[PDB]
Structure 1
Amino acid sequence: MPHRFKVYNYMSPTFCDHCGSLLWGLVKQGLKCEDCGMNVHHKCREKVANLC
């Protein structure tokens, strides 16, 4: 099954589970999967393996 990513606001430092770098910024830093909790940059969403 595909992931179900939503824009998300992180309150502690969080790394993108796809590309390894920090989700930088004060708000809306990345996307969180509703179902497995994986965190990714907006631009990394289309590239992540899609087995949730």
Structure 2
Amino acid sequence: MPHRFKVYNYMSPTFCDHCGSLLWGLVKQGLKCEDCGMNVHHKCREKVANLC
């Protein structure tokens, strides 16, 4: 099954689970998958294997 990513407002300095880099910003810094919890950049969404 595919991931179900949803824009998320990170609070704690959080890193992308795909590319390893920090999720920059105050709000809406990245996507958290609603089913498995994985955090990714908006730009890294298309870059991850879509098996959740």
TM-score interval, smaller chain: over 0.9
Q: CA deviation at 1:49?
A: 1.1
* TM-score of the superposed pair, with normalisation by structure 1: 0.96
Cα displacement (A) at 1:29? 0.2
Deviation of residue 10 (structure 1)? 0.4
Give the helix-richer structure, 1 or 2: 2
Shift of 1:45: 0.3
Question: What is the aligned-residue RMSD (CA, Å)?
Answer: 0.5
Match of 1:2 in 2: 2
Count, aligned residues: 52
Point out where structure 1 has 5 or more consecutive residues left out of the alignment.
none
Corresponding residue SS for 2:43 = coil
Per-residue CA deviations over 1:1-52 (Å, capped at 9, x if unaligned) read 1000000000101100000000011110000000000000001001111110
Q: Which runs of 5+ in 2 are unaligned?
A: none
Runs of 4+ in 1 over 2 A off after TM superposition: none
Per the normalisation by structure 2, the TM-score is 0.96
